[PDB]
RNA sequence: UGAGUAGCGAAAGACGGGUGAGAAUCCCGUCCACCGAUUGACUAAGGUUUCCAGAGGAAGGCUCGUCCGCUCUGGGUUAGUCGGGUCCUAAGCUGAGGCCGACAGGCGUAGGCGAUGGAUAACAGGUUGAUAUUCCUGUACCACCUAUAAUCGUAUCG
RNA sequence: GAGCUGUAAGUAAGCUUUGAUCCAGAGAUUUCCGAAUGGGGAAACCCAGCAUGAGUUAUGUCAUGUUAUCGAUAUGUGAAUACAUAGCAUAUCAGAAGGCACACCCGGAGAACUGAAACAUCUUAGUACCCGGAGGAAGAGAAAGAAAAUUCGAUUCCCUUAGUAGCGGCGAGCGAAACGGGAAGAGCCCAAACCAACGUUGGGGUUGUAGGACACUCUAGUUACAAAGGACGACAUUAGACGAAUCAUCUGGAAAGAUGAAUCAAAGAAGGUAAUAAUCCUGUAGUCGAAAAUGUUGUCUCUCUUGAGUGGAUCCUGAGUACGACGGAGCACGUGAAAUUCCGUCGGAAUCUGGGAGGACCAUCUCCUAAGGCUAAAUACUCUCUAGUGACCGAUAGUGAACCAGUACCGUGAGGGAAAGGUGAAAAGCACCCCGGAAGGGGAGUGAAAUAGAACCUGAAACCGUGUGCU
């Protein structure tokens, strides 16, 4: 289903990744096998591999009240065929 | 209870006497806005590009305890009531049975 | 703690006064005895006080 | 309210709403192609309105 | 008040050219000096964003500051094989049933748990502002799965 | 019943007289941890077994339910011991656990500093802390009682007796009851003899003016105790709605003030409004209001269900109990001349001519019937909820806390613990010009006031400066 949340469109995800390497931001309680199935049903492609990494919350606003941002989970799919994961 | 759209008359303040129509309402704070009364001249757009070509003067909210609802016949401020003649409530005048 | 099966004979508590009337808490235990009584189901080793044991009991 | 249809139609609608109007309208709020952003809340409420009705039938 | 007084926390810097409202102190260049069983290169505990880029100069920095481990806005960590879990247990902890005890509880059988130890399949190069036995290039190797097979069948797994 | 997406300004994008936002009752959803319960663990994490289901050629991977321990109750029931007395295996049950109101209430265990101007008896004190068990109250409770009159009639609470009688290194000190005046007002079920049936069940039967079995004759419900399960009408909480009566002119930035005229009052409580208001606004007196849920209490249903006198020929009326001896506790009562109550240990009674009590004990006379159990009201307290009051506080006060406080921080941990309110009626929060890298100023404007400019009312003293009249 819809495990993905939002693509990641930044430097290092724009060119050297541009070719067959798309960054997605996914739910924080899924494994990598699930992302290899959601990406193929949503886009109808063939996925080579998936890598995953977790981030820790940061300290947010020094001024006024102090706090933490959210933790996120960044995945990276490599396509053995096709393209057009994000436009 | 002054509703947006009707004609009123100032009872107290710098503009005692004048008459206008109600264009806004701040019901949480009991403030109406009357066209013509309480003009405030303001310094606007320090940087924001309108462009700044002077000073924008608008109205200022006044307290709803300072306006009264004129009588449609004698041209006289008055109080209000609720006759309940229609299945829905109806607002009527006080110095006369006629309506608003 | 140990308590008599048939009737709840249990340890009390009180003073141990001396001839100059000084006090110190002591305990007065009960004369319990391990015996096997013929409960319908099984004969099982239980505690019964040596006063309950008088006037007959299935042993 | 938009839940006047029969039981099968209701089951299809939820997939229709959530798999088109929610997922697609959020790959644009991220890349920056979306305006008229009030479309999101309306879609979110509709799915809630749908499920609430399905459940009542049980 | 003591008073513009004591102190400013071991150590070699000099000049030229830039930047700038502002330079003994920031950036680049040449020369000189110091460590070198270490002030060099890796990793454990621990710390927890201090890492990088472009902007900033009120406070913090024992002076100044155009600079920073300080402030603002965006970035950064990728594993079938590396280190732990789906393997094994010391010592210790725990403990169904059971024994003891005014209550609360104390002891402990089986069986669990638990490393600092025992087992167990990968290497050399390339690259980025910030990751590399993880990404890409080249060549491997391990457990599992369906397909088909030379040869079967009292073979076969225990 | 006309605006709205909270605090919190902005910025967009939209919903709404086809009834938004908002307020109440009933539902639906409700990730993970926690008694935590599938197994483990450094809470908020890791690893699984069975049953279907989704999915690929196939395994890997997901989804939904389910699987702790102890207790009861059926079941199968297959140790030694041949029948069989453990153990084991599967099923069944809004069965138990864990929190919390450090307030009140029963029970178990139980200090010391202190005082006596030392201290050992005693006191503090059966207080504090710890543990268990409850309830909205708990405990007590229907005379083996209190007394001395021609008697009272179950418990609890408050007055008063009374700082009396006592007790006591008779020191320090502790410290009653009855009566009498009142609040409140419920009294009743089992065992036993005896009758049948197949140790148990149904009927009987419950006590001091002696009761019953036995023997002949004959005659309303109290679901809060008493046997207890359900339908049953109007009050009351849970949002609201109507609701009387005023104008003018001075001084002001502004009238509610002053000055003149009037008006309502079952409404002259209170808070706001540009200054001090019964008549401007929310309100108050008084009347009106309920889909739906929950509480109290009524009239029918319902369900229970037989009531009284005479006869002792005769059998029944609670046993290792009452009580005694030794050692302790408690009674106001420190073992005394210590009755009346409880615990440990060893001895051990009678049966209505019986047995207990009336402050050692014995006779006479009065009162009362132990060794089984229940039971409401008057009383105690406040985490809370709604309505209110004060010769109570007014930011070093009042809660530690009017200010995102049990927090910044300090400690390995239990633990401790601060500081900090006010621009104006209204942001109308200083367009533009000049000096400067800025910060900050000098003008011009807003405003009644900027010596009200967000380090914002007023702005004291210490202390730091600048100018100057006599020395």
């Amino acid at each position: 289903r819809d495990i993905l949340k939002r693509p990641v469109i930044t430097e290092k995800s724009s060119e050297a990744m541009a070719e067959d390497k798309y960054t997605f931001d996914v739910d924080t309680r899924v494994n990598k096998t699930q992302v290899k199935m959601a990406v193929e049903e949503i886009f109808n492609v063939k996925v080579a591999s998936v890598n995953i990494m977790n981030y820790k919350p940061k300290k947010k606003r020094m001024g006024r009240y102090q706090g933490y941002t959210n933790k996120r989970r960044k995945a990276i799919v490599t396509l053995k065929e096709g393209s057009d994961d994000l436009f | 209870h002054i509703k947006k759209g009707d004609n009123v008359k100032v009872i107290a303040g710098k503009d005692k006497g004048k008459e206008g129509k109600v264009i806004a309402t701040l019901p949480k704070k009991d403030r109406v806005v009357v066209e013509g009364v309480n003009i405030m001249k303001k310094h606007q757009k320090p940087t924001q590009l309108n462009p700044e070509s002077g000073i924008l003067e608008t109205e200022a909210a006044i307290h709803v305890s300072n306006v009264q609802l004129l009588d449609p016949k004698t041209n006289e401020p008055t109080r209000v009531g609720y006759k309940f003649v229609d299945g829905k409530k109806v607002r009527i005048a006080k110095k006369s049975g006629e309506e608003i | 703690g140990k308590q008599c099966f048939v009737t709840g004979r249990k340890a009390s508590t009180g003073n141990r006064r001396s001839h100059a009337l000084n006090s110190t808490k002591r305990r007065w235990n009960a004369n319990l005895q391990k015996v096997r009584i013929l409960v319908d189901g099984k004969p099982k080793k239980v505690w019964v006080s040596a006063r309950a044991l008088k006037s007959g009991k299935v042993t | 309210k938009e839940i006047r249809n029969l039981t099968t139609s209701e089951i299809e609608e939820q997939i229709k709403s959530s798999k088109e109007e929610l997922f697609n309208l959020r790959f644009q709020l991220a890349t920056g192609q979306l305006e008229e952003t009030a479309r999101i809340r309306t879609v979110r409420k509709t799915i809630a309105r749908l499920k609430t009705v399905a459940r009542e039938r049980e």
Side-chain angles (χ1 to χ4, degrees), chain C residues 2-54:
Chain C
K2 352 182 216 319
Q3 181 209 11
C4 178
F5 178 80
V6 293
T7 175
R9 306 304 192 86
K10 305 162 315 314
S12 173
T13 316
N15 286 316
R16 176 183 305 292
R17 298 188 178 284
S18 62
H19 300 291
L21 281 74
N22 283 119
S23 298
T24 287
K25 328 285 305 185
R26 62 163 296 187
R27 274 220 270 81
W28 320 62
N29 303 128
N31 198 2
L32 303 159
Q33 303 292 188
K34 179 64 83 164
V35 70
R36 211 172 50 172
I37 61 171
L38 177 63
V39 179
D40 32 37
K42 310 187 173 59
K44 32 205 175 56
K45 302 294 283 170
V46 292
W47 296 89
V48 167
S49 43
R51 186 178 192 77
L53 265 191
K54 305 196 313 168

Side-chain angles (χ1 to χ4, degrees), chain B residues 44-52 54-55:
Chain B
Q44 211 156 36
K45 264 60 183 153
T47 292
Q48 218 284 309
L49 175 46
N50 281 9
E52 61 268 358
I55 277 171

